[PDB]
Design a protein around this ligand. Structure first.
Ligand SMILES: COc1ccccc1-n1c(SCC(=O)Nc2ccc3nccnc3c2)nc2c(c1=O)CCCC2
Length: 822
């Protein structure tokens, strides 16, 4: 039984558990045994939460960042239902009290015993929150539709919970022996090396003597470093590069000088090197698992006596305002001098101080660390910055995690992508971030869900495979039931892969309608219907994908032939009609990042009461160049609409009317006005979003309208101006905002203010986007490579300017954009 769990975990994570043992590594072993006890205590805890609390775990509330409305309510084991008027201000409890008073008459005869489920979703309404604080209610309030909800009793929910049970002495300079290698090139070999603490070098880099591009090369050289061993910080990192010359990089490799047990390291080491794009401090500190093929450097760490890093007690024992809002040496000096007063009157400039403290002087570091332990907790925003690679020191990390704990799950979810990337930076397996992500993922099934996928999605990447795999195994130890739910998901994804593969070959030999019939046959196979049905959508686990409508499924006409999968739910009705797009072949990371940053803008706007009617559809990479997009129904490309087909409702004398006619036919009479509004708001939003983010090559083929008028974007290939992309006003948008008039400066300038608000709001959170992008550098995304990329943001948000200025700046670009418009 314990045996079956293991094989399930193996299949689930994409790596077999035997491989962890085969490593014969105490670091891994400890991480495994430790992290299991932890996840087991969490899982233990959970099985004894009260029912409401279990709901909170299982399906956390989805909330928005007087007026009448019709609601429909039913009770679980029955079809009969009732329609009430309520106020949008009513508590979920008031509604539940009605439900019951209605029932008990149609039946002859306590609201606290119930929670309201959304029909056909893993979504629930509970708490003291007026109805439309719940996203679902408020959402309905807009698209116009009637909320449909099911009274679920406490006995019913608890049944679910049930079914889910399971030192300073050493003064001599540091130096190593470089012995020999085993590599491939054309010319002389060289081995350069430096000691890093983050991005900063601890002293000048040193080099090898020029040998023949030959062997199996030999060196047997002392390389001595311009620093004394006693000054080596905890997180000291030794970084190698190997290249040829007579310029030409071959491989690289890094290691920590202290092991995970704080022991300094001796003596011989074989390093299996990673092939190159010279020195790479950010690169991982464990070796290339491809031992057969990979080049290897063998070194000798001299044995300086056994030595550990001193305990914390031993550590603990041992116009400035004007600058303080890059700095000269002299300034650096003043800051350091004022450290105490920094910790007293500018605690939020911590990051600035840490950047001036001398990491290659053990005495200075001890001073810095002493101030850290009395340091007041910082705001979340400051914590996100402290996770930067610039801050490799784990006492700082511990502090940053310490400050990060007051994250709401919503915030946590909103940054989860980035926190995962930072795991790639971690010098050791057992660490605080890992401990924290696991703990929060265990207290929240939604967080649990996405963490897994973020991790499961990168197992094809050898540098993170082990780390990630070990985390996923830990999590499963913490959630036997959720791992079943997830296998269901990965089983569906496996089938989709096989289906898409068939689609690629077939689509080259034959015509679309034929491949479509073939697809449906393959899908109608027993193994496919079972695999592809009755699951939770990986794009959002509260979305249930029940019955695939084979008849509706097809594939899209682009190189990779992405699949189009429609699902219905009888229990869910209309909002059980959902689609996903399976994509195998393209990298989805770029888009997912893009989609999350827009999502962020929307939350920011909404937190200041600006609702631009955005459309944040799911996008979720699941594996090697494989993931899913959320289908947005009742929409079409501008281009498609501008095919302006005769026979359709939008038959137009001039192409500029096409959109507006379409909108008219979907939105008769007084509905028309609302749709123009929806179009205007969301346009404002996507214009500002594409502009700040440097997303370009927008054309009518990658912009979509929905029948509500809402406009949104697909196919993000390029961002951060990655061919300075202008602001863009398409003539046809302007025309639609202007209600079909040549001049409508009333309508048009309202539109300007929306942009201006959206833009100005984002700037106030400029730093929040910077820190997040900072953290993304860890990803290896090709258009997220360096500083010039983070420069793009600085410039778009005109962050260094004043609001009066920036607005002025933005006003030119926006004008420039209107001029372009015919
Ligand atoms: C691959 O996309 C195409 C490229 C060239 C020509 C046509 C398509 N294409 C297109 S082009 C529209 C498009 O490229 N993408 C869409 C269409 C709807 C979307 N909804 C939510 C999120 N993204 C969406 C993206 N659409 C469809 C199909 C299709 O083959 C098949 C049936 C379902 C809709």
């Amino acid at each position: 039984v314990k045996k079956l769990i293991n094989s399930q975990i193996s299949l689930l994570i994409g790596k077999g558990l035997h491989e962890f043992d085969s490593l014969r590594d105490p670091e891994v072993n400890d991480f495994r045994t430790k992290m299991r006890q932890f996840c087991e205590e969490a899982a233990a805890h959970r099985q004894q939460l009260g029912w409401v609390e279990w709901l909170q775990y299982s399906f956390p509330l989805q909330l928005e960042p007087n007026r009448a409305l019709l609601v429909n309510v039913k009770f679980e084991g029955s079809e009969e239902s009732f329609t009430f008027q309520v106020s949008t201000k009513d508590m979920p409890l008031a509604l539940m009290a009605c439900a019951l008073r209605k029932k008990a008459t149609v039946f002859r005869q306590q609201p606290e015993e119930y929670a309201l489920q959304v029909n056909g979703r893993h979504e629930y309404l509970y708490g003291n929150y007026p109805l439309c604080h719940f996203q679902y209610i408020c959402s309905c309030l807009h698209s116009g539709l009637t909320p449909h909800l099911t009274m679920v009793h406490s006995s019913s929910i608890l049944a679910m919970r049930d079914e889910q049970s399971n030192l300073w002495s050493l003064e001599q300079p540091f130096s190593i022996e470089l012995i020999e290698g085993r590599k491939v090139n054309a010319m002389k070999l060289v081995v350069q090396a430096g000691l890093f603490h983050g991005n900063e070098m601890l002293c000048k880099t040193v080099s090898s003597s020029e040998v023949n591009v030959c062997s199996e090369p030999v060196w047997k050289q002392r390389l001595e470093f311009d620093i004394s061993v006693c000054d080596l910080p905890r997180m000291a990192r030794l970084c190698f590069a190997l290249y040829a010359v007579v310029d030409c990089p071959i491989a690289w490799a890094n290691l920590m000088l202290f092991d995970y047990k704080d022991q300094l390291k001796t003596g011989e080491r074989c390093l299996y090197m990673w092939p190159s794009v010279l020195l790479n401090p950010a690169g991982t500190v464990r070796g290339n698992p491809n031992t057969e093929s990979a080049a290897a450097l063998v070194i000798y760490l001299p044995e300086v006596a056994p030595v550990y890093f001193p305990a914390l007690e031993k550590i603990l024992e041992l116009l400035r305002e004007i600058l303080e809002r890059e700095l000269y040496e002299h300034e650096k000096d003043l800051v350091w001098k004022m450290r105490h007063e920094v910790q007293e009157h500018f605690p939020e400039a911590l990051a600035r101080l840490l950047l001036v403290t001398k990491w290659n002087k053990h005495e200075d570091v001890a001073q810095m660390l002493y101030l850290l332990c009395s340091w007041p907790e910082l705001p979340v925003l400051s914590a996100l910055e402290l996770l930067d690679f610039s801050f490799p020191d784990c006492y700082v990390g511990s502090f940053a995690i310490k400050s990060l704990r007051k994250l709401t799950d919503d915030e946590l979810f909103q940054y989860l992508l980035q926190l995962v990337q930072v795991l790639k930076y971690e010098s050791y397996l057992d660490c605080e971030l890992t401990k924290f992500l696991l703990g929060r993922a265990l207290a929240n099934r939604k967080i649990g869900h996405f963490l897994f996928w973020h991790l499961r999605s990168e197992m094809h990447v050898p540098s993170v495979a082990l780390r990630f795999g070990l985390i996923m195994e830990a999590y499963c130890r913490g959630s036997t039931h959720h791992m079943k739910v997830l296998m269901k998901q990965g089983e569906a994804l496996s089938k989709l892969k096989a289906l898409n593969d068939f689609v690629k070959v077939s689509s080259q030999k034959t015509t679309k309608p034929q491949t479509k019939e073939m697809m449906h046959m393959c899908m109608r196979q027993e193994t496919y219907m079972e695999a592809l049905s009755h699951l939770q959508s990986p794009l959002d686990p509260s979305t249930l994908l029940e019955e695939v409508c084979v008849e509706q499924c097809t594939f899209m006409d682009s190189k990779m032939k992405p699949l189009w999968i429609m699902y219905s739910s009888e229990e869910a009705g209309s909002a059980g009609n959902v689609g996903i797009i399976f994509k195998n072949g393209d990298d989805l990371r770029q888009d997912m990042l893009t989609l999350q940053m827009i999502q962020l803008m929307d939350v920011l706007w909404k937190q200041e009461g600006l609702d631009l009617r955005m459309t944040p559809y799911g996008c979720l990479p699941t594996g090697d160049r494989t993931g899913l997009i959320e289908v947005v129904l009742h929409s079409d490309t501008i281009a498609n609409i501008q095919l302006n087909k005769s026979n359709m409702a939008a038959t137009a004398a001039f192409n500029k009317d096409a959109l507006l006619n379409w909108l008219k036919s979907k939105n008769p009479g007084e509905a028309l006005d609302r749709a123009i509004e929806e179009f205007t708001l969301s346009c404002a939003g996507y214009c500002v979003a594409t502009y700040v983010l440097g997303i370009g090559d927008r054309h009518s083929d990658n912009i979509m309208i929905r029948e509500s008028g809402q406009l949104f974007h697909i196919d993000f290939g390029h961002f951060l101006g990655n061919f300075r992309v202008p602001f863009i006003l398409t003539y046809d948008f302007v025309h639609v905002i202007q209600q079909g008039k040549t001049n409508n400066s009333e309508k048009f300038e309202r539109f300007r203010g929306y942009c201006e608000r959206a833009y100005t709001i984002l700037r106030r959170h400029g730093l929040l986007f910077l820190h997040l992008f900072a953290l993304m550098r860890a990803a290896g995304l090709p258009e997220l490579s360096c500083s010039k990329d983070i420069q793009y943001l600085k410039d778009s948000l005109a962050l260094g300017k004043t609001e009066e200025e920036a607005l002025k700046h933005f006003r030119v670009k926006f004008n420039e954009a209107l001029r372009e418009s015919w």
